[PDB]
């Protein structure tokens, strides 16, 4: 289970940036010995588009500055209660 | 460099936790898939051997709690400037 100790990793460090309000997707894979990675992050419906951008960022450098094989990774938002 | 790799992970983590004046020995190895280590860090020579005590257990659970693998984990301190 090496892949699934990578996701716990992405997942809680996604958790731990201010504005996420959980991670309704992930999807990670192998390219090679790299990860590449898709995730969804919830926010809430009342940010503004901006808002959810900049968390999505704060996502992405979060995670990538953690898990050091991670060399693709896109952060998306969706409305979450 | 994947031991490479979990020893900065251990590293990182012991000095985020308050009262450690860095790492001044890290020895880590596989036993099996499980790491096994042992670690020196620096303390504040005025603070008392209890308190000295803590911080070793607080580096501890802080470097278990992040790096799953790890099974054993041997923390000591010594006086750092």
Do not use: R
């Given at each position: 289970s090496?892949?699934?100790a990578v996701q716990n990793r992405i997942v809680e460090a996604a958790e731990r940036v201010p504005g996420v309000r959980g991670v309704i997707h992930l999807r990670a894979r192998y390219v090679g010995q790299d990860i590449w990675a898709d995730m969804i992050?919830?926010?809430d419906p009342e940010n503004t588009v901006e808002q959810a951008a900049e968390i999505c960022e704060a996502?992405?450098?979060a995670v990538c500055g953690k898990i050091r094989r991670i060399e693709s990774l896109?952060?998306?938002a969706a409305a979450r209660e």
């Open positions: 090496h892949m699934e992050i919830g926010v996502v992405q450098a896109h952060v998306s």
